């Protein structure tokens, strides 16, 4: 059921799927391919159920290839998309032969899939597959953009023939427009299970933010707005068991304390209601306001799943108890404002009890129930109904609601813009924003849309996994790397909250980090939240992510993915490739870990703030500088031993690995440092190396480069003396093989050449910091060649 997905991701190499598909949209190879297959599988499920002819047809189709029914359908679309996307300028379609080897699939199927892609019907048996895939292919157009565009592109294009065949499979197409809101997200799953069930016969497919697209079997019960409206009345009502639990003790306390007299007047109501001391007792003598809160004051602002349940499951909760004692309460403490006994009241303030009948009379009060309370059940309904007239409109559904006349309603909501009779919509959302959905949040949009059948599958667990960033482009495959990313697949997902009708998903930050969050999103806290972000993107098949404290923050469309925020930093800029983009943030992911170990708990806030600005500044010139941004300027302990040797040492290799592919400038820089780092251990065989014992000559040449006197020299004239000073100090300190010294010379030349190029751009003042950066980075590279498998 979900295992097909596992196999596919296991076969495609990490970088294979991370790659950008089309220049038109920010789509990942994996995102699109897996998605096409997902829909493909769901489609065949519908056919098997509805068409009995197609059911047997699909059955024989499986036997032809000796492939399990379900599995045969999925990989069909997945590969079809890949072979279609082989239109990338390379066309090296030989890549599929590797996939075929890991998939262990027959060539005949592929030969058919080739004619499914380019060609036409393999044969009439292969028709449902030809149809299913074509449908899914159309649904994931570069930018379908709108649900209506789907229908326009349907019929207009070759996809029309498939719709013609769909009708013959006793299956029709439909859609419902739905606007994104906080309330929609929570009950989204419930609706899918209740309204769009295979029981009624709906099989939901994908959503595009404008709404949802689904299927309708012939003679299926039509989509009815009645239940749509009936459901929220119960859901917009946060009637949890614990919501009802308080009043259980509230009014219990008011009455349980008088158990003495709440049983005695079962006989001789007069012996208790009357006293020899006078005539009668005060309500407060029998029910003190001290321990008793008035009924309507007890039920402050509740309606039915709370107040009618408070008039049912709370009138009869322990009312099996002192059914006799409970009576006096409603007979007397009917609370302030409404002393409306509205019953067989005799008007006697006290002797009424003797005149009335026995406990058979209780049932009559139970008849007065389901009256004023259920009024609130059908009261603010039309306030909400306006959404089902405007927001939840444009649908193949049927409106089952009254007209919106409600002659003279009350004012329209100040914020949600909805009339009443603010609004409860924002009120419910505000109670929710207290804890159920506390800010800030992580929102990931999907282009054009995302299969609902996959939206209920993905989850994640970063509790034990902590932060993990060790991946390779071609070594580890997508799945193995996804496993390291701590991603999970639960049909009953618990830590992911998807707005199924908005082609987007939100993740509450509370489950992601145990860190203390804030009321909003701040630049300081933004830093701490960033390392987890790229992982989320990768877990969601390389999809763009935005971090924000307001859900309705609409995200900002290059062919590449974009990790963005309320405010955008330069280092967060999207590079020419998704592979590179992720690696750039994976660099921060690694730096964060080290900083955590280095700075103290409180010191981290100020530490990270500085790292952020520095990384931003360096990346402005070249992204490669961004990758190496550790600091080496002003603001951090220059305690190299308490810094590099402490935690930066292991990830160094990975960081340098990234610096290798970010830019050609960085390619030259990385190679140069590494060449020198290899040469270093040759000369200084001994590991009695000190800080200055290895970098002195370098700094000597650097100071010389920057010495104002040498600056007036031409680019080549200056780099001449600069390197000449460096290598002079080297041979002053240690003799150099005339053979070996040449390697370093050539490398240093490019180093000083780029130094002139980072001086051509930007300012020489800033360039100095980058020199110090690379300086300490050279010692690091020397420690890395000295690593030699050191745990
Ligand atoms: Zn409102």
Numbering used by the authors: 14 to 103, 107 to 437, 477 to 611, 613 to 847
Provide the publication's sentences verbatim.
Type I-D CRISPR–Cas systems, which are found both in bacteria and archaea, are exceptional in that they contain a hybrid large subunit, Cas10d, bearing resemblance to both the signature proteins found in type I (Cas3) and type III (Cas10). As predicted from comparative sequence analysis, the 847 residue (94 kDa) S. islandicus Cas10d consists of six domains: A HD nuclease domain (1–186), a Cyclase/RRM domain (187–425), a zinc finger domain (426–490), a Palm/RRM domain (491–623), and a C-terminal helical region consisting of a polymerase-like Thumb domain (624–719) and an extension with predicted homology to Cas11 (720–847). In this paper, we demonstrate that the S. islandicus type I-D large subunit, Cas10d, has a unique structure consisting of a type I-like HD nuclease domain joined to a set of inactivated type III-like nucleotidyl transferase domains and a Cas11-like C-terminal domain.
To answer this, we finally pursued a structure of the isolated Cas10d subunit. The isolated protein does not readily crystallise likely due to intrinsic flexibility, however, we were able to obtain crystals of a mildly trypsin-treated sample and determine the structure at 4.0 Å using molecular replacement. The new crystals contain two copies of Cas10d in the crystallographic asymmetric unit, for which the flexible N terminus (residues 1–13) that interacts with AcrID1, appears to have been cleaved off. Moreover, the Palm/RRM domain has been nicked by the protease resulting in the protein appearing as two bands on a denaturing polyacrylamide gel. Nevertheless, the structure confirms the overall, extended conformation of Cas10d as observed in complex with AcrID1. The helical insertion in the Palm/RRM domain, which interacts directly with AcrID1 in the complex structure, has shifted away from the core of the protein by about 5 Å in comparison to the complex with AcrID1. Together, this suggests that the flexibility of Cas10d is mainly caused by the extended Palm/RRM domain. Consequently, it is likely that this domain gets organised when Cas10d joins the backbone complex and forms the complete I-D effector complex.
